[PDB]
Amino acid sequence: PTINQLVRKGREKVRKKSKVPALKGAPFRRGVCTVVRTVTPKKPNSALRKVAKVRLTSGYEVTAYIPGEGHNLQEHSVVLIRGGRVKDLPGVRYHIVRGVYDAAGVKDRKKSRSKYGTKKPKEA
Amino acid sequence: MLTDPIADMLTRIRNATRVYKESTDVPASRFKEEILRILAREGFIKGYERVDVDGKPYLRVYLKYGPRRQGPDPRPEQVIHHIRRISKPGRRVYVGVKEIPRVRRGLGIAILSTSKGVLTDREARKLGVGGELICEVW
RNA sequence: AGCUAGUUGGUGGGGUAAUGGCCCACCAAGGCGACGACGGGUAGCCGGUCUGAGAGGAUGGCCGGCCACAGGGGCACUGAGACACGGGCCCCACUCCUACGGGAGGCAGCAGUUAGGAAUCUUCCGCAAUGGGCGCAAGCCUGACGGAGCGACGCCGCUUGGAGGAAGAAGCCCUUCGGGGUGUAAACUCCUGAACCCGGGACGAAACCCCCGACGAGGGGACUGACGGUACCGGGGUAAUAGCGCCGGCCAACUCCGUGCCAGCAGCCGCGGUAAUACGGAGGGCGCGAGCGUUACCCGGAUUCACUGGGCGUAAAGGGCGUGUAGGCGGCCUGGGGCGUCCCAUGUGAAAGACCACGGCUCAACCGUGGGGGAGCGUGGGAUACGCUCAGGCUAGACGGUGGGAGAGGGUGGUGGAAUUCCCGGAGUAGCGGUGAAAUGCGCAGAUACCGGGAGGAACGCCGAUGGCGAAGGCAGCCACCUGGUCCACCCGUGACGCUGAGGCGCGAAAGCGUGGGGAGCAAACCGGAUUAGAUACCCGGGUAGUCCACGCCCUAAACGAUGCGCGCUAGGUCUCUGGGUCUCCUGGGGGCCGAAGCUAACGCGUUAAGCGCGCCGCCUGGGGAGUACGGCCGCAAGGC
RNA sequence: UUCCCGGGCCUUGUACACACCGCCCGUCACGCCAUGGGAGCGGGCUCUACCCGAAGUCGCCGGGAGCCUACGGGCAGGCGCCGAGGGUAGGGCCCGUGACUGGGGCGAAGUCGUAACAAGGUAGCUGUACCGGAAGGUGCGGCUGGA
RNA sequence: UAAAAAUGUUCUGGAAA
């Protein structure tokens, strides 16, 4: 466009949209699972992913994913939302953080334990 | 009605140089001759010369090329490789003496219009003046 | 998208340290707005900070400057200064006391509590220093400040040892059961000595003050250390923590077992369905280390809003077309001004930070001293090429004049023949019509086919196109009248009068809408026949809007060259329409095809550019949601923007 | 050698390439999700006019009323203007919510058909209009991105 | 340029390489 047309209209900044409204960007956000079920994934893949539907301190009720194998969440377990989406679950855009509040670490995990609560076993 | 005499002149040169024309005609303007004088001194053209086409004042620029070459396409190398108008009416460009551009690491030249006359980058720098930046040629 | 009554200005007042509608009478009607007023949202601004090659982008926490506020709110008093954080008056909400009539408070000062939260510290020591208030002074006050505490929150320094030590222990893992790996790693040998122990132990503190000299200069004297019995130094001195991520490709790092589209992984592409370097464990490896990962947010990469530095024929992107307002932009020669612009000087540009040099803590991180940048804007001086301005001069752009030209360009009236339908009159008889085949239908109440006459509506065969005209939509018998564009020739007149164009205004196929008129043929809808599994379709028979005219609306399109308007420049060959020619052919305007150079992802475009350039406008930033919703404007509606 | 089956070679169209035993369109039904409309309901902010109007400066009075001194005056005290806030009423902006309702996106193996892609079996696309369970069909005009 | 010619439907989800 003509310089004159830039002088008049000028350019336009992009403005990025957040993939995670956990308000204040808040690295995380606390909440309570009001529904803790298992959804069937998107396509290529088949499975029974375990997802909790949690009510938040942001004033939002979102559905999040419970990473790892085997979890201990019930209809009222307080939980810490982390934000990180799941490709197959059309709805889930956040990950429940293992090892915080009612969320138990992953029993017997031995690799990447840091990413799953699961403390550290004593070589005993 | 032609909106930029100079721009046009630079273009007419470009156009014929690229089709290995012996010379090209361009409408006469005192300011334009200046440019041409510089284009000749720094060696880009063989020379210009006020002449008259159909009763009107024109400038006949004489182009300069390189020697013929081998392989396919023997079209010679070009002396005027690039030649782009910097300051146009749609947006003028003035440069402080410190701001003067260095064209092609030195193997090229910009042409300024200063309060001391239409001089080249070196001439302008030495004279410590700055100005409107007509074009650059390499 | 319009806003404004103290509103805009005036005169005389009040007010103030002072200008001023700051406030007030009176007067005048003003002020402001697409260069975005009014309004809505968000936000304290800066030095700087992060990022970036840079231009930029993001940001404004610590430290420094300015502003503002002190539970919410209004006001004044004292005073050099406040309409006053720990002063006052009052209202309010809240919390507390009360001998119930009145009293009390305001941590956004330092510590600390609770709430909220993913999350943010001690009710610490000292005025020893620096700084402040008051005092002649001694000195008093000082949660400013100097320290200490807590938290890997960050940066930097350091440790968990060093040198020997096997064709190589064990254990664990692989294996073509020879062996290979973890691995000089361990064990084992010497060697140093983080911690801790004993002794010593700071700088930061020299003047206030005192004495000689005058309470001046200068010299001497005394008191004073929170951190601390800390740093640091001397001697003694024990082998003394290791974890986190990752190993399919991007990307450094591979094997065995388990599982079997399960359990699970996943930043992108994607891994898993009985032999998975991708899931989970192990061995092994790679990376980094008191750390290592994860999430959130900023810049980069992203020339992916492109100033630097992009685009629009087919990928997103040319506005349906005109006319034109504001705006932007502007030919050739000369002179005056010197706003733009450029040059010198000079003021300013605090500090810290950043950079560089050198220094101080054993180094570094921190820290000091010095050095160098700096556009911007003020002032004075100077230059005049280009832009600008005034002025004079020109004719190459543009417009005009005269003489001519082609044309379905437009409006209005009139009118000619072919054909269809219907009606009347002849004449004639058994079917016609229609399809893939048929049937409905029409017909012996006389159709079809034939001849004659009539009415009426709509469209114009041949010419006729690869043609012409128009800004587009679009325009086709013939005649006349009114009228637009446009081209050639002569170069006669004006003398830059030019290009473009947000808005505005005008036009704008078909369908569609409102009055009334018109209605032959055609034909959505609708009814039959047939086809078919069905047939709301294709085929057949009927048929109403409509199609036609007038006046007024509607404003869309594959409104297309999917290609905006203008000007300059850059090989040719060929066919064609229209003009002029010294009619071999040249030259002007237009319509095509092929192709120089060049351009393009390619296809292709190529003097009718999609090439090489300048000016102005429109428009595009992944797909879907969606040209949808909400809002506004428009319309009778349908809907349009 | 028309046709039916399989196949050579050239050519043309293609949205096919798991390669026509291909691709693919719309309704219906089922679930999650965000969103428009909706009797109306609950709010936040904001504007106008009116009534009540504290403190306080300011302007009059300062009297048949008190007190001062540095008493020509001053102070207390009274009246008024303005005024925080409160109150009645009506507008504007935005947010939440609402029986029911509209379409939208997404969702391994549902239902109906067959619109499109090869004269996709009626060339396709298109603006409009009427019609139809659905894709879509037909009318009028336009395009070639069809022969 | 002008441009004739076909009544007749359909093929679950992943993965092929």
Model description:
Chain B: GO terms for molecular function: rRNA binding; structural constituent of ribosome. Chain B: It holds the Pfam family Ribosomal_S8. Chain B: Keywords: Ribonucleoprotein, Ribosomal protein, RNA-binding, rRNA-binding. Chain B: This is Small ribosomal subunit protein uS8. This is part of a larger assembly, with chains A (124 residues) and B (138 residues). With 124 residues, chain A is mainly beta. Helices cover 5% and strands 24% of the residues of chain A. Chain A is built from one helix and five strands. Chain B has 138 residues and is an alpha+beta fold. In chain B, strands 5, 6, 7, 8 and 9 form a five-stranded antiparallel beta sheet that branches. The structure holds three RNA strands.
Question: Which descriptors would you attach to this protein?
Answer:
part of a larger assembly, 2 chains, A: 124 residues, mainly beta, OB fold (Dihydrolipoamide Acetyltransferase, E2P), 1 helix, B: 138 residues, alpha+beta, Ribosomal Protein S8, Chain: A, domain 1, Dna Ligase, domain 1, 5-stranded antiparallel beta sheet, 4-stranded antiparallel beta sheet, 3 helices, 9 strands, 30% strand, globular, RNA-binding, rRNA binding (chain B)
Question: Got a strand count of chain A?
Answer: 5
Main sheet of chain B? 5 strands, antiparallel
Q: Please state the CA-atom Rg of chain A, rounded to the nearest Å.
A: 20 Å
Looking at the structure, the CATH topology of chain A is OB fold (Dihydrolipoamide Acetyltransferase, E2P)
Which descriptor suits the 3D outline of chain A? elongated
CATH topology of the largest domain in chain B: Ribosomal Protein S8, Chain: A, domain 1
* Strand percentage of chain A: 15-25%
Number of helical stretches of at least 4 residues of chain B: 3
Supply the CATH class of chain A: Mainly Beta
How many domains would you count in the coordinates of chain A? 1
What is the name of the CATH architecture of chain A? Beta Barrel
CATH superfamily of chain A: Nucleic acid-binding proteins
* Element-level helix/strand string of chain A: HEEEEE
Taken as a percent bin, the fraction of beta residues of chain B is: 25-35%
Structural class of chain A: mainly beta
Based on the coordinates given, report the CATH architecture of the largest domain in chain B: 2-Layer Sandwich
Shape of chain B: globular
The radius of gyration over CA of chain B amounts to: 16 Å
Tally of contiguous helical segments of chain A: 1
Protein name (chain B): Small ribosomal subunit protein uS8
Family (chain B): Belongs to the universal ribosomal protein uS8 family.
GO biological process, one term (chain B): translation
InterPro entries (chain B): Ribosomal_uS8, Ribosomal_uS8_CS, Ribosomal_uS8_sf
